[PDB]
Structure 1
Amino acid sequence: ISKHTQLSPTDAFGTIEFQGGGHSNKAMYVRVSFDTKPDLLLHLMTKEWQLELPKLLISVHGGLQNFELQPKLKQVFGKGLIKAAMTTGAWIFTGGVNTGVIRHVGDALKDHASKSRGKICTIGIAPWGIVENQEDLIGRDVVRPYQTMSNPMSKLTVLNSMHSHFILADNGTTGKYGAEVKLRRQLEKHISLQKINTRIGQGVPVVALIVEGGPNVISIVLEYLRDTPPVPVVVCDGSGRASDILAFGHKYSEVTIQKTFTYTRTQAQHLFIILMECMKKKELITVFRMGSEGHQDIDLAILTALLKGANASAPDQLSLALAWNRVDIARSQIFIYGQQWP
């Protein structure tokens, strides 16, 4: 139909205990419509959940299918993401369900939690129609036990544990995606314009991290690069998806006979227009390669892309590094030859 649904009030919020895992993890959750205003969501996330305003935002857009990353690459990626999100007070925006790169983020969080103190404010924005149990969560402001057991024949997926908070957005359907991308992008836009504690006049920096992907990953990368405030992105090579294609296309800026991969509708259908537009705006793309290029640490790759991606002056970069409490970042990048401080 043409979206003819009932505008019922919300009936599912509180805290869920993930029974089954070896970790005692609590996760706040709410169920709101996909058309909810970003301001009210920020109010809920700041005042009701008692979360401080982040100094950094990370988006972990990736593939939807359960791909597998080779060893010695997913481990360093997880360690770098954990270090970047822990040393710097930051929020992580993920899909929420236990499919794709979100499983990698979940095991990275799980491995860190067994060795170090502190908590990571990981936030999952998942559609309501894909959870394996639409029931067992309707209890309002009361702890509802949840099961992490996965049934392969249930045609759905379980909610990924090791996530601090959930934002379950529903468009009225069940069993299909697409009910959270626009809301997530609107929330990112609204929190990017939010003022940081510093009185300089700069908002919260936002970065995007790409692992694996697909045809729509190129589209969302292009949309990120075309925002009125540009948003830098970071990609990886050992994935084997359009992220690897994007990294390959990063080299040799303006090989057009290499457009056949048996991945789309032959040579008749191509994403070369959006790919070449992204390579035209390639000043923001950052590629992380193991031992090939520089920036062997991904946590350094994320932070160094934020300083150059803001296109601000040296005082603003120094203020950002001061806010993140990263002395080495300012030592190796900001304090170099010929800076011309005001």
Structure 2
Amino acid sequence: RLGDIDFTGVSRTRGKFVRVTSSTDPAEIYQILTKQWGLAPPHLVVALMGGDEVAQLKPWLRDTLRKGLVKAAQSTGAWILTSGLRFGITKNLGQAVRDHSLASTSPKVRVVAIGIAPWNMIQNRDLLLSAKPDHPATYPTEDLPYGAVYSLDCNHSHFILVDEDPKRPGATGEMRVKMLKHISLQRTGYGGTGSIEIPVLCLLVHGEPRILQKMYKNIQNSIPWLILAGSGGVADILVTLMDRGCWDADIVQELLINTFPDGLHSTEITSWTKLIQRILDHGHLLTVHDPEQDSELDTVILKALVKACKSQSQEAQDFLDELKLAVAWNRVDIAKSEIFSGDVQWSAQDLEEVMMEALVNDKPDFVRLFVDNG
């Protein structure tokens, strides 16, 4: 089910898509993304897990988040996994991605916004149902209100239209989780010689209690999460719990009730409390991003990844991917503070490849650091 979309409206753009069922293997979709659509394996994957709630971010925080994400992503080739629906934070994030793409004087590195959207949420699905390979389907762009149905965003280059599973109404979440897990087990390069394991990272923006199960499943899959300090939903609960230092069942229940007065179900409240406790039990996979304080998303992403790697193991070869990513972002301070601090032994054979990468990509600070480190 491959087709092309020719969005018609203020800006005429061409976008690809593929229909898929929730029972498919994510390996096939990854292969079709890499080969059929010509997308190079990303050097960074940032998945959005929010912004579909009625309450939306303030324009200042929305702009700060989009600028930080685009600035972090533009160094390398990154993918931004969002629900390809023209609404909320997703619409503006796709707008920022397309604005960067148009203004990008270097097409070698490309920031691609992939859209994983449910088939039940698509407006005018019959219009794209034609999907003639010779003649791309014409799709009209309409800025619908919240409601329950949205239109495909024109700014998203590629789409993954998942069909709703008759078993449970969570097919899109399961597909997103499986896709993130599968992508996290790939190599960022064409060959496994100078390639890193793809850094998959999730971002939470004003989540609802319904997505707690998917978030915990992702955490079980061992992929880091970033929490906006001023998002508003479950993100506020998590940042308040982090500020507390410790989590208690009564405390989390009180915060959940205060933040979500509408939801009052004893079984649901208990399940969400248990899910939140189990999520906070990990901790090392959770990291808070405060745009009012830090406003440097790349630094926080690198810190979260290096924290996860350090929690995983102490071997030098394990830290290699994080060090290479730090090289690619000129974060010599972060690398010196985290990776090259006492605990990890560093041999010349271990550092030869990273030395090559820093030397080719014109990173003098990392060259100095590696020469000074063996």
Normalised-by-shorter TM-score class: 0.7 to 0.9
What is the one-letter code of the residue matched to 1:340?
Q
Matches within 5 A, 1:250-269: 250-254=242-246, 256-257=250-251, 258-259=254-255, 260-261=257-258, 262-265=261-264, 269=268
Tell whether 2:125 aligns with 1:134.
yes
- Tell me the distance in 2 between the aligned counterparts of 1:307 and 1:154: 40
Cα distance change of structure 1 residues 49 and 209 upon mapping to structure 2, 3 Å threshold: same
Q: Deviations over 1:8-64 (max 9, x none)?
A: xx4xx3221211123x42211112222222222122111111111122221111142
SS at 1:265's partner residue?
coil
Matches within 5 A, 1:15-54: 15-22=4-11, 24-54=12-42
SS at 1:328's partner residue?
coil
What is the one-letter code of the residue matched to 2:218?
Y
Tell whether 2:178 aligns with 1:186.
yes
Question: Counterpart in 2 of 1:328?
Answer: 330
SS at 2:3's partner residue?
strand
Cα distance change of structure 1 residues 290 and 188 upon mapping to structure 2, 3 Å threshold: closer
- Tell me the distance in 1 between the aligned counterparts of 2:188 and 2:99: 31
Question: Counterpart in 1 of 2:298?
Answer: 299
Question: Counterpart in 2 of 1:6?
Answer: none
SS at 1:21's partner residue?
coil
Tell whether 2:169 aligns with 1:165.
no
Question: Counterpart in 2 of 1:210?
Answer: 204
- Tell me the distance in 1 between the aligned counterparts of 2:59 and 2:88: 16
| Runs of at least 5 residues in structure 1 that lack an aligned partner in the other structure | 1-9
Question: Counterpart in 1 of 2:360?
Answer: none
Cα distance change of structure 1 residues 55 and 288 upon mapping to structure 2, 3 Å threshold: same
Q: CA deviation at 1:155?
A: 5.4
Is the CA contact (8 Å cut-off) linking 1:54 and 1:89 kept in structure 2?
yes
Higher relative contact order (CA 8 A, sep 6+): 1
- Tell me the distance in 2 between the aligned counterparts of 1:25 and 1:280: 45
Matches within 5 A, 1:215-234: 215-227=209-221, 230-234=222-226
Q: Deviations over 1:49-104 (max 9, x none)?
A: 11111222211111423432123321111011112222121212111112333123
Number of residue-to-residue matches in the alignment: 323
- Tell me the distance in 2 between the aligned counterparts of 1:283 and 1:172: 33
Question: Counterpart in 2 of 1:124?
Answer: 115
What is the one-letter code of the residue matched to 1:184?
R
* Aligned-residue CA RMSD (Å): 2.8
Q: 2:137 aligns with which of 144, 149, 155?
A: 144
Is the CA contact (8 Å cut-off) linking 1:253 and 1:279 kept in structure 2?
no
Q: Deviations over 1:175-227 (max 9, x none)?
A: x9633222222222222222344548962221111111100233222222222
> Normalized against structure 1, the TM-score is what?
0.84
- Tell me the distance in 2 between the aligned counterparts of 1:286 and 1:112: 26
> Normalized against structure 2, the TM-score is what?
0.77
Q: CA deviation at 1:234?
A: 0.2
Give identity over the alignment, percent.
30
Q: Comparing both structures, which one devotes a greater share of its residues to helix? A: 2
- Tell me the distance in 1 between the aligned counterparts of 2:176 and 2:55: 23
- Tell me the distance in 1 between the aligned counterparts of 2:80 and 2:127: 26
Q: CA deviation at 1:151?
A: 5.0
SS at 1:39's partner residue?
helix
Q: Deviations over 1:139-179 (max 9, x none)?
A: 23131221112455995210012111011121377xx9633
- Tell me the distance in 2 between the aligned counterparts of 1:94 and 1:324: 25
- Tell me the distance in 2 between the aligned counterparts of 1:269 and 1:178: 17
